[PDB]
Design a protein around this ligand. Structure first.
Ligand code: R3T
Ligand code: GTP
Ligand code: GDP
Ligand code: CA
Ligand code: MG
Ligand code: MG
Ligand code: MG
Lengths: 53, 319, 426, 441
């Protein structure tokens, strides 16, 4: 057991004890959001088409 | 009413425990995947311990100790004894053993040669081969991890018959980690003159089914050797059971855990001609003798199950 | 501010709707003149869900009253709370619907439906954020059944992204006005399958049996049946009218109760129900046991003949919340056979501190059970008994309907029954 | 000095953020009106508490915080609460209708319409930073806003602040206080979308906080207020190193360096002790050894699981109060001989210890007793994968029947995202298993 990296200050201290060694771009996100919005508009159009019948 | 599920249809012990619970009128069996249970009689392999104790308003109990496999697998039992200071490599009741992978291959040869230079018969298991020299033992294993163990060349031989045997002890550990030894053991005796393997799978000459129980065996030790089963053997058996289970208790105990565990173990012992007891293996999912099924399974319900889920002379020895 | 627009259509819909508004006006401290006179701020915290605030701190129900004859709505306006409704929200004709779905849906109702939608549009335009609609109606008559489902179809067309909820009274031969009720109910059920998100199935057979066998009323009236409904309608909307965490709005309720879009027909229940002993204090174990008993549920279906997909339970009054959890998890773990294992934790529990006017404690049950198929089976059997001989069809063909539309309605409900049987075995 | 911005999303995130900033003000001596009589540099400064607080010329200390919710009732309580004067309206963003416990509604339908406004308000706080180091994101797994909108915001934050670190405080769903049946869906959906955008996430299982409140605080039916005051204590223990003078975990990147060797396995287990009821007149004050021993009791963990059957990759000890390094080492030596503490072979078997002398602050009138010393242990153990296993099992049960799926597809999401999210969780469970894992007889 050993204590290393002992740093002390007025509000406390810290140290280490060793016991044994051994992204999508903006356009890509915009496409996904608009693709889901298109699918919502398509389902709503089918609904209104169904209600018109 | 209490609820339980069955996840191992092949367990003769808990197939009897389940029908005992279904005979008290206070236990109902659910479908095997219904999570709203009080008691799980779980599967032998890959039991989902991580999904236990997360049902609000349910005290959940399981019939297996997570992590007890370290004691019930041959390779890990050797590693546990040689690395745990509670047992030490100087352990006197466990035969000299080595874990080798097809590694302690070099340490095994140094010990083997040092006594062949000065009898050294060993055994291989994990599919059993008993050879007299080391070159033949290593070739059979390369045909999974195995262990080479010193073979007991001088066993205690029953008379008449000049026959080998082994002792099976059943041990129940409840949720409070009380260690209960069933007062009834069985001797799986060989029917051939010394015949080297005494497993019940491998007849009926001197006793029915090659099974001698403690009453007859104790009577034999008094007539032939002028001693008792309690003094000559059972003190060592109780000592070995306590040593093994207390060693792994901090690793497997469920005292402050969100679910509780109990488990039935099968301890296999051997006795040499000097009446010294040796530990062979520990069994995590053991079967029982046909006569002792009713008494032991009822003891499991009384000690391990009803202690947590109460209903509306003990057969165990508390260690 | 998530406002709900209430609509009551036809004789049954308006008489039940009237009692509902009387009941929740008392709970929120609203007198028959629209003035608040309560003593708790919990009564006003979510009062905008059902009431508009007019000049002078008066509260006007966001309710629209619809009928094809004036009779029932005249009696409502002359009723106890009749003056609380906005007079413009009375939309009625004069010809009536003659217990005829075709008249309500295709001829007489079509002439009036645009006037109702004008009032609906006016109430919606004054909503900070309208969340949906609730319709009170019967399925056995002509106006509530035929025109009510016509209203739903046209409301969905104009507000496709809003929740549609109904309290639908199912007909029964034991409590029957005309023999064509199975025809009208079969035609309406298909509309509800397509165009509602939540439908509380209220069986007049169950209401009668509860009044007779439990409440010990020898000769129940329609007023006795409507008394049970208003108490149930108050219970199932407690989560919408008072502060709470669970099922707080119509869309969250639908997300928790409807695993499959077409299977959105709920069995309601109320506890306690006792004869007149009535002063005896009720305990939490007693509320829970009655709430889950079949004799307390109003769809006339045995839940032990099916399995629960989702369950909502609301407890009202001052009681031990710990004791509420215990008994709820007690009946749930003791009868886990009747809950589907493939929807974990499908029983949600809510507690409201404010009890009903006359009780210290009460409980309301909302179950989406596959046993509701027994209700649609009964209606299908009664429909087929007449349709196989084309009996009484001339009332409908005389309004322009064809026999094919009846055949399709028969098939749609048999399909609905089969869909429930699919998940009852799963 | 490098500033940190806190983001609170949904009811759970907002109500927890409210409890933290109340505790922060008590710890730093900041009054509800924003005044701080100990800050002698009026109108500016680069002190350690300035990482979480900006300053106005009038001397008001303003949290570097954004509150966002899709319905206004929860954030309205912040507008009228005790610390209402602390925030200006730009920090509080509300919609009119919520995500209805539907990930797809929070992520796609409503999220697309409010994400630009949220980023604009966040940019306003970022522009007031001389050296922004990243964000702390508070949200639930089960809510439609906390799951759906957070995973969208985390994607855009990686685009607009690619160099900045992101830490999460996430509320794991527990049926005892859960408000929705589809919370396993939303949890898996948001973990999949957020996994590559979060550098370190602290999960808190409501079931664990609930049971700690019942056992240790003697509260028969804990409320969100009870749970949030306990959560705010653990959160304060984790963020104290950024807000006070010290040398351990002094910036957000050190959290990843000290706790997360593998980028995907970034879910440290938190354990806190002691939790002591304020109703009892006298409590025996636990020692350094006793509170350090309690860090290895499953009953004190933020997620109930068994670290004995996993492997450690890292372990930090954060003490507050009367603690000297001599007693910590003596406690570690005693514990290591009696506990099952096994590390992976490629990591050192050791502990990084941080001590802050100021004892933990308790809210006046709260349920927590004032103690002389406390400790929070942050350990990266593979045992926390038990929480993923429970969650993925509930997912599998409902998804096999496609229960409730239509609600998500109806909002523009595809069924393939469900299985795509599930396969990622299957891979995540496999990564934990690779790192931490060694009849009728
Ligand atoms: C509902 C309810 O309690 O029903 C029973 C029946 O089983 C319950 C149990 C009771 O204890 C028992 C028996 C009462 O003895 C009680 O003295 C009493 C209450 C509390 C009265 O109900 C109230 O005042 C409530 O606050 C109430 N509002 C009204 O009902 C309007 Br009047 C309400 C309920 C739920 C939600 C919101 C508001 C009703 C009742 O007539 C009596 O029911 C009926 O005879 C009845 C007949 C036919 C159909 C339905 C009920 C009653 C009277 C007698 C006045
Ligand atoms: N610990 C804690 N958990 C909370 C709190 N509020 C909600 N939760 C949990 O969060 C989950 C519900 O998600 P919410 O945050 O309330 O929902 P939301 O993020 O607002 O999303 P929507 O309401 O659907 O728009 C449930 O599991 C709750 O138990 C809280 O104040 N404290
Ligand atoms: N529960 C209840 N059912 C009613 C009431 N009035 C009529 N019904 C039922 O509703 C059906 C008749 O529909 P009704 O509302 O009178 O026709 P409508 O006015 O044209 O919509 C029959 O099944 C009746 O049993 C009532 O006040 N209460
Ligand atoms: Ca300053
Ligand atoms: Mg009528
Ligand atoms: Mg919300
Ligand atoms: Mg064996």
């Amino acid at each position: 057991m050993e204590v290393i990296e002992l740093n002390k200050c007025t509000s406390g201290q810290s140290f280490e004890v060793i016991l044994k060694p051994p992204d999508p771009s903006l356009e890509e996100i915009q496409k996904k959001l608009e693709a889901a919005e298109e699918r919502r508009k398509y389902q709503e159009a089918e609904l209104l088409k169904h209600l018109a019948e | 009413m209490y609820t339980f599920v069955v996840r191992d249809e092949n367990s003769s012990v808990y197939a009897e425990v389940s029908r005992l619970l279904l005979a008290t009128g206070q236990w109902k069996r659910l479908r095997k995947d219904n999570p709203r249970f009080n008691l799980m009689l779980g599967e032998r392999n890959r039991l989902p311990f991580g999904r236990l104790g997360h049902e609000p308003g349910l005290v959940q109990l399981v019939n297996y100790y997570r992590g007890a496999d370290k004691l019930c697998r041959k390779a890990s039992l050797v590693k546990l004894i040689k690395t745990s200071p509670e047992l030490s490599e100087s352990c006197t009741w466990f035969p000299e053993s080595y874990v080798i992978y097809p590694d302690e291959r070099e340490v095994f040869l140094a010990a083997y040669n040092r006594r062949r230079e000065g009898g050294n018969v060993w055994i291989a298991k994990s599919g059993i081969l008993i050879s007299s020299e080391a070159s033949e033992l290593l070739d059979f294993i390369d045909e999974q991890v195995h262990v080479i163990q010193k073979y007991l060349e001088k066993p205690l031989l029953l008379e008449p018959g000049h026959r080998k045997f082994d002792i099976r002890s059943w041990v129940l550990v409840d949720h409070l980690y009380n260690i209960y030894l069933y007062r009834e053991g069985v001797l799986r005796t060989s029917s051939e003159p010394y015949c080297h393997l005494t497993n019940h799978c491998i007849y009926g000459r001197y006793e029915e089914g090659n099974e001698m129980f403690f009453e007859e065996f104790n009577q034999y030790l008094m007539d032939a050797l002028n001693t008792t089963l309690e003094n000559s053997i059972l003190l060592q058996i109780k000592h070995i059971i306590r040593s093994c289970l207390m060693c792994i208790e901090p690793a497997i105990s469920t005292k402050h855990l969100h679910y509780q565990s109990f488990q039935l173990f099968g301890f296999d012992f051997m006795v040499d001609e000097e009446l010294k007891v040796w530990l062979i293996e520990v069994n995590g999912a053991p079967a029982c003798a046909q006569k002792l099924y009713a008494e032991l399974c009822q003891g499991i319900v009384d000690v391990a199950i009803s202690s947590v889920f109460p209903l509306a002379t003990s057969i165990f020895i508390k260690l | 501010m998530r406002e709900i627009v209430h609509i009551q259509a036809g004789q049954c819909g308006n008489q039940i709707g009237a009692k509902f508004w009387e009941v929740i006006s008392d709970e929120h401290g609203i007198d028959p003149t629209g003035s608040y006179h309560g003593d708790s701020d919990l009564q006003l915290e979510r009062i905008n869900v059902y009431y508009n605030e007019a000049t002078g701190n008066k509260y006007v129900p966001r309710a629209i009253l619809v009928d094809l004859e004036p009779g029932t709505m005249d009696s409502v306006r002359s009723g106890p709370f009749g003056q609380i409704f906005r007079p413009d929200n009375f939309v009625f004709g004069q010809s009536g619907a003659g217990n005829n779905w075709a008249k309500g849906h295709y001829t007489e109702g079509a002439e009036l439906v645009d006037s109702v939608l004008d009032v609906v549009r006016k109430e919606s335009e004054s909503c900070d954020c309208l969340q949906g609609f609730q319709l009170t109606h019967s399925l056995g008559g002509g106006t509530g059944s035929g025109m009510g489902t016509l209203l739903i179809s046209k409301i969905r067309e104009e507000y496709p992204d809003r929740i549609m909820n109904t309290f639908s009274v199912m007909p029964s031969p034991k409590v029957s006005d005309t023999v064509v009720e199975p025809y009208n109910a079969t035609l309406s059920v298909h509309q509800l399958v397509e165009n509602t998100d939540e439908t509380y199935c209220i069986d007049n057979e169950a209401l009668y049996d509860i009044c007779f066998r439990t409440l010990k009323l020898t000769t129940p009236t329609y007023g006795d049946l409507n008394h049970l409904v208003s108490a149930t309608m108050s219970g199932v909307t407690t989560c919408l009218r008072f502060p709470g965490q669970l099922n707080a709005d119509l869309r969250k309720l639908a997300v928790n109760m409807v695993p499959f879009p077409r299977l959105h027909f709920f069995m309601p229940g109320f506890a306690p129900l006792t004869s007149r002993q009535q002063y005896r204090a009720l305990t939490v174990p007693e509320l829970t046991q009655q709430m889950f008993d079949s004799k307390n549920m109003m769809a006339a279906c045995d839940p032990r003949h099916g399995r629960y997909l989702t369950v909502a339970a609301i407890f009202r009054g001052r009681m031990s919340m710990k004791e509420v959890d215990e008994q709820m998890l007690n009946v749930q773990n003791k009868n886990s056979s009747y809950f589907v294992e493939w929807i974990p934790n499908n029983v949600k529990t809510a507690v409201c501190d404010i009890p009903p006017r006359g009780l210290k404690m009460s409980a309301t049950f909302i179950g989406n059970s596959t046993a509701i198929q027994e209700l649609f089976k009964r209606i299908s059997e009664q429909f087929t008994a007449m349709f196989r001989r084309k009996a009484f069809l001339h009332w409908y063909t005389g309004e322009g309907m064809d026999e094919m539309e009846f055949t399709e309605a028969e098939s749609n409900m048999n399909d609905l029954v089969s869909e429930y049987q699919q998940y009852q075995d799963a | 000095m490098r500033e940190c911005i806190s983001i609170h999303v949904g009811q759970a995130g907002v109500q927890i953020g409210n409890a933290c900033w109340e505790l922060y003000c008590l710890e730093h001596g900041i009054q509800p009106d924003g005044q701080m009589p100990s800050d002698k540099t009026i109108g500016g400064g680069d002190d350690s508490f300035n990482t979480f607080f900006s300053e106005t010329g009038a001397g008001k200390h303003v949290p570097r915080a954004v509150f966002v919710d899709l319905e206004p009732t929860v954030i309205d309580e912040v507008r009228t609460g005790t610390y209402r004067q602390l925030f200006h309206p730009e920090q509080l963003i509300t919609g009119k209708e919520d995500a209805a416990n539907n990930y797809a509604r929070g992520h796609y339908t409503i999220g697309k319409e409010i994400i630009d406004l949220v980023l604009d308000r966040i940019r306003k706080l970022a522009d007031q930073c001389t050296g922004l180091q990243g964000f702390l994101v508070f949200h639930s797994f089960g809510g439609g806003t906390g799951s759906g909108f957070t995973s969208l915001l985390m994607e855009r934050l990686s685009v607009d602040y690619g160099k900045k670190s992101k830490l999460e405080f996430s509320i794991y769903p527990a049926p005892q206080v859960s408000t929705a049946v589809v919370e396993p869906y939303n949890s898996i959906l948001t973990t999949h979308t957020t996994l590559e955008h979060s550098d370190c996430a602290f999960m808190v299982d409501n079931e664990a906080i609930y049971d700690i409140c019942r056992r240790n605080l003697d509260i028969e039916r804990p409320t969100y207020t009870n749970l949030n005051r306990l959560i705010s204590q653990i959160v304060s223990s984790i963020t104290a190193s950024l807000r006070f003078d010290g040398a351990l975990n002094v910036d957000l990147t050190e959290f990843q360096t000290n706790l997360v060797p593998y980028p995907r396995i970034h879910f440290p287990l938190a354990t806190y002790a002691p939790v002591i009821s304020a109703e009892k007149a006298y409590h025996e004050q636990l020692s350094v050894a006793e509170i350090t021993n309690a860090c290895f009791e499953p009953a004190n963990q933020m997620v109930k699981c068994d670290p004995r059957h996993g492997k450690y990759m890292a372990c930090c000890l954060l003490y507050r109060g009367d603690v000297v390094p001599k007693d910590v080492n003596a406690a570690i030596a005693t514990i290591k001989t009696k506990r099952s503490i096994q590390f992976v072979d490629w990591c050192p078997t050791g502990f990084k210890v941080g001590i802050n002398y100021q004892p933990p602050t308790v809210v006046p009138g709260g349920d927590l007793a004032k103690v002389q010393r406390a400790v929070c242990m942050l350990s990266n153990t593979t045992a926390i994968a038990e929480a993923w296993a429970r969650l993925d099992h509930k997912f599998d049960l409902m998804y096999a029947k496609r229960a409730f799926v239509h609600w998500y597809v109806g909002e523009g999401m595809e069924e393939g995202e469900f299985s795509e999210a599930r396969e990622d969780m299957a891979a995540l469970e496999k990564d934990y298993e690779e790192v931490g894992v060694d009849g009728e007889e």
